[model samples]
Target: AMGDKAKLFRNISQRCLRRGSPEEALRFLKLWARHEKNDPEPLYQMGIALANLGDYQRAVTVFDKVLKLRPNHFMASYRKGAVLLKIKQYKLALPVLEAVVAAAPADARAYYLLGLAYDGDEQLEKGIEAMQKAVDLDPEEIKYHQHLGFMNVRKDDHKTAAEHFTKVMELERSQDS
Candidate 1:
């Protein structure tokens, strides 16, 4: 039914999904695991497809399979962590997100996600610190400022919270202009 054309399947899957046809993309991915079901690329693509479909639990399961097939799979690691976070499995997501940050330190969004995981796990100080790093790396990001404001409020640092919210307003005003 399917060929040994993994790249062909992967390409079509991505293209179809990007066109807002995740269901169609899922059909194309059927060609990916011709025999070796443990194929990392196929599993990763399936995870992405499942995620796009808003099936986070299945996406996490696929990402787990992808990681087992290829332990250092960067996308798998990141996606698994992200899905876990989406499900509010913050404690489980922490180490995975930590690795993501280690693998790509300059990724401000990774740090932002890490901060959320930390906050969800009740590591308020660490959450604030991680968010601070995210804000530092991407100062103009209104969401980063908003998150920092929330974290500071959690710590009862009303002054710092106001400062971040003020920055958020300034950033939003700039974006609106």
Candidate 2:
């Protein structure tokens, strides 16, 4: 009976999230969490719901709880790092994302977030290098190219910047067509 209720709440919460109604998801997620005290899955979903609702600090706390329950929870760490970046806590985000990048070296998204953290910390060269790695990994991702272009411009490398910008335009045009 308890298992059935937990599953029901989990399904409802997941559906709410998919529908972009994080507020509703949070309601069901809380119940789901209560039923699964030792499970980190519901707590992780709650953190994501809170994050989507712009309750960033609360999300961070929830992610922290998830980490305590399962130290190597990759998504929890990534979300915590991303939330820190969102709040402009670059110093705190740095190590978190660095760990994420180290764990998932082939993930372009991790590298992209790491680049943003580096840029926020005012390490422009390292930021450029990280962004370049993201672009190299997923050249078709327009925002990666766009950010790389902007970073190059900041470094007064307009020629390289223009090349990236050109790629962005090409990709955008293709996407539109």
Candidate 3:
């Protein structure tokens, strides 16, 4: 039994998040959830809003409940893993991102996040491997190349990074052709 206030807040939150103002949207969500603590939708979206606001700890807490209610939530798992990685809890985020990749084999974003998690932990080999797989999964995305290239640059693998950046330029050229 949601109150009319909760309904109004939920609509505002949805509108904000959809408009790319997730932080603003999440503030409404927090107020809404305070009104009806049991609604998993608000809890789940709180995780989303918190992530956009860079509040990883609360995001993790919110997602934990979302997972409890829906154990096999693939997207939620990915987001939780991403927040863990954001907070530099690399080791803990691994299995969660791995589960996301397992659920969606073609998900380049999952691979990209997993690569960063491994890279953050100084596992260069695995990081590169995951990133390479990401490129394979989404060859057309400039962002995929940019992420890999940035890592390669940081690792002082300038040649490898150049190759990726070059690929991005080539892809852009092809798209414009």
Candidate 4:
């Protein structure tokens, strides 16, 4: 009976989140957490809900809880890094994002986030390098090219910046067609 109820709550929470209703997801997530206190999934979902609601501090705390239960939880670490970036705590976000990239070298989004963190921390060259890596991994992602262009501009490399901007324009045109 308890297991069935927990599963139900979890399902409803996931559905709510999928529908972009963090508030509704949070209600069921709280109930689901009560039924599975040690399970990291509910806490992870709760963190995502809180982050989506723009309650980044609480989201980070919830992600910390998830991490406590499972230090190897990559998603939890990634969320924490993303939230730290949102709060403009770039210095704090760096190591976390760095660890994520190290753990999942093929994750383009992780590299992209790391690039943003580096940019925020004023490491322009490193940021550009990271952004280039993301672009290399996922060449079709427009934002990567866009940001890489901006980063090159910051580095006073107008030629390279123009090249990336040209790529961005080409990609956008293709997407529209």
TM-score, per-candidate, Cα-based: 0.90, 0.90, 0.75, 0.90
Can you tell me which runs of candidate 4 are displaced by over 4 Å?
18-20
lDDT of 2: 0.93
Query: What lDDT score belongs to each candidate, Candidate 1 first?
Result: 0.87, 0.93, 0.89, 0.93
| Candidate 4: tens digits of C-alpha lDDT, residues 24-73 | 88999999999988989999999998998999999999999999999889
lDDT of 3 by residue, 132-166 (tens): 99999989988889888988888899999999999
Give the range where candidate 4 is weakest over 10 consecutive residues by summed lDDT: 1-10
Give lDDT: candidate 3, residue 108: 88
Off by over 4 Å in 1: 1-8, 36-38
Better of 1 and 2 by lDDT: 2
Q: Where is model 3 more than 4 Å wrong at Cα?
A: 1-9, 15-38, 147-162, 172-177
Clashing pairs in 2: none
- The TM-score of candidate 3 is 0.75
Model 2 misplaced regions, further than 4 Å: none
| Alpha-carbon shift of residue 128 in model 4 (angstroms) | 1.0
Give the better candidate number (1 or 4) by lDDT.
Answer: 4
